[PDB]
Amino acid sequence: GIERKLEIEKAVTDVAELNGELRNRQYLVEQLTKANINDVNFTPFKYQLSPSLP
Amino acid sequence: WTSAAVVTPPEPVQWQELEKTFTKLRVLDLDIKIDRTEAFNLFIKKFQSVSLLEEYLRSSPYVMDQLDLHRAIVALSEKMKAVDDSLYTSWTLSFTAPTSEEAQTVLSGYIDYISALVVKESIENVRNKLEIKTQFEKEKLAQDRIKMKNQLDANIQRLNYSLDIANAAGIKKPVYDPDFSISLGADGIERKLEIEKAVTDVAELNGELRNRQYLVEQLTKANINDVNFTPFKYQLSPSLP
Amino acid sequence: KLAQDRIKMKNQLDANIQRLNYSLDIANAAGIKKPVYDPDFSISLGAD
Amino acid sequence: WTSAAVVTPPEPVQWQELEKTFTKLRVLDLDIKIDRTEAFNLFI
């Protein structure tokens, strides 16, 4: 068994293939890269009185 | 010719309606309140808004009867006052006009107008909080499902190698290793593997996921519909002087 | 909450059932008919 | 010939669009706020 385990491990190209946590960190980076904050409009105050005409 | 009202934060019995609605949402894992004192303070704040007063007078058919107009509105709006009055919080709201009956009708009318505005915004908040909960739980579920899929994919690869090692070690039948479990034996491992490759929906074997989906559906179905309430309690309703 | 817990419970059971189905297939594949004397699909009880 | 405005920190209802955006980000493990009072203080 050790012999075959060894040659399996030697053949591993991508540490992510056996590691779920790594695959998911990749997913996170992909989703973070795709995300946009696009122009949200808002007003940084509330009028108690809008500019008066005297 | 001055009408006055004394006003105090609302009592729990006036919140019963809202409390039923908060309970529907509490069950759905959304903990939401409209604080009785904050609602009151919001009412006071809006009452004190000159712009809101003006919009009220202009829209009031009553006031309209009795473009020099603008100066008139401005002069009327100067006669709405609110003052802080101790065992419990209370404010005196007053309006002064020529007729006594005019004073009372305007004050009462304005109070109702402001009151309707606070209930409108207040329920709008609850609705918005619901909208955010729904959006979040939905997007998180979609994400957790992809995360789960990725773990299954990785488990499949590991099970594949488990097969090879079991075979190499000549373990066909279940036995009577930290990285590639072998105990099940090649015969079992082979069927386990094909079962797992066949999995099409990560939620079929995972109760948690099925439940999170139920929660999303229930959140989507939920409504906050127009609850009526008063953001204050009258100690004195607008007087007829 | 009771109503809800019921449905949550049902969902749990349905998922358990699917797991047990697969347990049966793996039990059979590994030739375990009688109780033996696996973290995902328990087979110790045997196919019978 | 003097115009005046009275101005107060914004209320939650005006933040809803922002809070949709902060939620997309919250899911992606980024906890972000624009504090209503701080926004106001920056305006002033």
* CATH code at position B180: 1.10.287.210
Cα–Cα dist B110/B104, whole Å = 10
Put simply, the answer to whether C7 touches B206 (Cβ < 8 Å) is no
Cα–Cα dist B122/B128, whole Å = 10
The position carrying tokens 């909080």 is B129
Compute the nearest-CA separation of A46 from chain D (Å).
5
List helix spans (H) across chain B: 16-27, 36-47, 50-59, 61-65, 69-77, 100-168, 185-198, 207-221
Residues B141, B106 share a domain: no
Q: Which residues in chain D are contacts of A30 at CB distance < 8 A?
A: none
Question: Phi and psi of B133, rounded to 5°?
Answer: -60, -45
Cα–Cα dist C41/B180, whole Å = 16
Q: Which residues in chain D are contacts of A40 at CB distance < 8 A?
A: 17-18, 21
What's the sign of the alpha-carbon dihedral B127, B128, B129, B132? positive
- Please indicate if any CB of chain A lies within 8 Å of the CB of B175: no
Cα–Cα dist B3/B237, whole Å = 10
Burial B99-131 (b: 16+ CB within 10 A, else e): eeebbbbbbbbbbebbbebbbeebbebbbbbbb
Residues B147, B68 share a domain: no
Residues B152, B62 share a domain: no
Compute the nearest-CA separation of D19 from chain B (Å).
8
Q: Which residues in chain D are contacts of A52 at CB distance < 8 A?
A: 3-5
List the end-to-end C-alpha distance of chain D, in Å, as a whole number.
23
- Residue B2's DSSP bridge partners are B96
DSSP string, B91-104: EEEEEE-SSHHHHH
Residues B97, B63 share a domain: yes
- Residue B6's DSSP bridge partners are B92, B236
Cα–Cα dist B238/B102, whole Å = 12
- Please indicate if any CB of chain A lies within 8 Å of the CB of B151: yes
Between CA B135 and CA B139, with CA B136 as vertex, the angle to 5 degrees is 85
Residues B90, B142 share a domain: no
Residues B167, B66 share a domain: no
Residues B113, B222 share a domain: no
For residue B78, how many other CB atoms are within 10 A of its CB? 11
Compute the nearest-CA separation of C27 from chain B (Å).
7
Question: How many domains in chain B?
Answer: 2
Put simply, the answer to whether B139 touches D12 (Cβ < 8 Å) is no
Residues B154, B118 share a domain: no
Put simply, the answer to whether D5 touches A40 (Cβ < 8 Å) is no
CA dihedral B17, B19, B21, B24 (to 10 degrees): -140
Cα–Cα dist B70/B13, whole Å = 42
Residues B137, B115 share a domain: no
The enclosing domain of B19 has a CATH number of: 3.30.1890.10
The position carrying tokens 């009028």 is A47
**Which of the residues C22, C34, C36, C42 would you substitute to probe the B interface, choosing the one with the greatest number of B C-beta atoms within 10 Å?**
C22
Cα–Cα dist A24/B67, whole Å = 67
Q: Which residues are CB-contacts of B69 (< 8 A; sequence separation ≥ 6)?
A: none
**Which of the residues B43, B161, B196 would you substitute to probe the A interface, choosing the one with the greatest number of A C-beta atoms within 10 Å?**
B161
Q: Which residues in chain B are contacts of A47 at CB distance < 8 A?
A: 49, 51
The position carrying tokens 């066909």 is B172
- Please indicate if any CB of chain D lies within 8 Å of the CB of A48: yes
Residues B162, B110 share a domain: no
Q: Which residues in chain B are contacts of D17 at CB distance < 8 A?
A: none
Residues B53, B96 share a domain: yes
Coil vs helix vs strand at B179:
coil
Coil vs helix vs strand at B2:
strand
What's the sign of the alpha-carbon dihedral B27, B30, B31, B36? negative
8 Å CB contact between B92 and B83: yes
Residues B17, B64 share a domain: yes
CA distances to A39, B145, B148, D30 from B152, rounded to whole Å, are 38, 10, 6, 26
Range of the domain at B155: 126-228
Q: What interhelical angle do B100-168 and B185-198 show, nearest 10? A: 150
